[PDB]
Ligand binder design. Structure first.
Ligand SMILES: [Ca+2]
Ligand SMILES: [Ca+2]
Ligand SMILES: [Ca+2]
Ligand SMILES: [Ca+2]
Length: 394
């Protein structure tokens, strides 16, 4: 019951950390190229702990002359699930993804090509630090639901980088745009003739990928043909060392749902099943921060799938599930620590933890605070240090 009070307060602090970061796929118009650009950050969990970040910069430009839709700023929100085919002997990846557009609060001819199930083919040739490879993929897309299902095989044998590092490179035309956002769908507007998609992908503390792809219909089939070049990777880093987790570790016990609901209720103080800017502002002040109305709006917008300007319960569950699927960076975890460690000395004291609990509205007398400090205090100094916090947080 003191482990329930860490869990709750921890989840709240994590929720605020999610709402204050930029996890989606940000798309903007690029009038000079009659297309778009994007930027986003991908997290690759490192198998023995930690996260490997990959910073993406993207440009798309139409292959044809016909007119295209240039969007207002918005984002795509991706849910990916990687798995293995138990009968496949070759080095491979099975991928299932659901992609939805959002970020604009409350139809081109190309879009007609996507109203049913469309076969897909993908072909990639790569070269990373001189290690060459090829990948072929096939499956289908159902843009009505933002859905893709694909299987990929490394046709040259063993893949010299981890599969997850290639997911972004391996058809954003299959995204589901909501009815109020159909005029911002560049990708389908450019079909059937297609677009060129280019990226540079920076793997933090390591090398980079450069990619160029052509995405277009070839008969009935939507084809993505790509070349990729990787340079400057460390032979012992996460990429060439194969130190990244493959598998989407996507639990969500009913128990975990229940813990997220408890943190939800800390925000949703009128119990109506949705969090407003007023409510989010209340929580953040009480934790020491002082956001403006604009920032609170932008925070909500980051996870506001229906665009009504509030975070409803299912939208909060979705946000929290994703925040637990991928590991936080050391900078992020330190930030969370600093919410508690108010004097910055590296130690959460009983006094500091009371101050946060008092301030967040809990009745908890000196007594139970102690009980909480004690629960987390591994080395018995009567305080919680960074490493004890990191553990209390998993
Ligand atoms: Ca509410
Ligand atoms: Ca909403
Ligand atoms: Ca302190
Ligand atoms: Ca301690």
């Amino acid at each position: 019951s003191s482990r329930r009070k860490w869990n709750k307060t921890g989840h709240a602090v994590r929720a605020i950390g999610r709402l204050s970061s930029l996890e989606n796929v940000y798309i903007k118009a690029d009038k000079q190229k009659n297309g778009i650009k994007a930027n986003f950050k991908i997290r690759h969990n490192i198998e023995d702990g930690g996260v490997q970040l990959a910073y993406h910069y993207q440009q798309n430009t139409p292959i044809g002359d016909g007119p295209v839709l240039l969007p207002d700023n918005h984002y795509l929100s991706v849910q990916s699930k990687l798995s293995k085919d138990p009968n496949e002997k070759r080095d491979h990846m099975v991928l299932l993804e659901f992609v939805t557009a959002a970020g604009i609060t409350l139809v081109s001819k190309g879009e007609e090509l996507f109203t049913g199930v469309v076969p897909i083919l993908v072909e990639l040739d790569g070269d990373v630090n001189g290690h060459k490879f090829s990948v072929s993929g096939e499956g289908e897309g159902d843009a009505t639901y933002g859905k893709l299902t694909l299987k990929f095989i490394c046709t040259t044998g063993k893949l010299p980088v981890p599969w997850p590092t290639l997911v972004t490179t391996l058809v954003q035309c299959f995204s589901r745009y909501p009815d109020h956002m159909k005029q911002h769908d560049f990708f389908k507007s450019a079909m059937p003739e297609g677009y060129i998609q280019e990226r540079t992908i920076f793997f933090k503390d390591d090398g980079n990928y450069k990619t160029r792809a052509e995405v277009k219909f070839e008969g009935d089939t939507l084809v993505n043909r790509i070349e990729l070049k990787g340079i400057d990777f460390k032979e012992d880093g996460n990429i060439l060392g194969h130190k990244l987790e493959y598998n989407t570790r996507d639990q969500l016990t009913e128990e975990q749902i229940a813990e997220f609901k408890e943190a939800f209720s800390l925000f949703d103080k009128d119990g109506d099943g949705t969090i407003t800017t007023k409510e989010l502002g209340t929580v953040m002040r009480s934790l020491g921060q002082n956001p403006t109305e604009a920032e609170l709006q932008d925070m909500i917008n980051e996870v506001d799938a229906d665009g009504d300007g509030t975070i409803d319960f299912p939208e909060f569950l979705t946000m929290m599930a994703r925040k637990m699927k991928y590991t936080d960076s050391e900078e992020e975890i330190r930030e969370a620590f600093r919410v508690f460690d108010k004097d910055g000395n590296g130690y959460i004291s009983a006094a500091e933890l009371r101050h946060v609990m008092t301030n967040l509205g809990e009745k908890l007398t000196d007594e139970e605070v102690d009980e909480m400090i004690r629960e987390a205090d591994i080395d018995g100094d009567g305080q919680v240090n960074y490493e004890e916090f990191v553990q209390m947080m998993t």
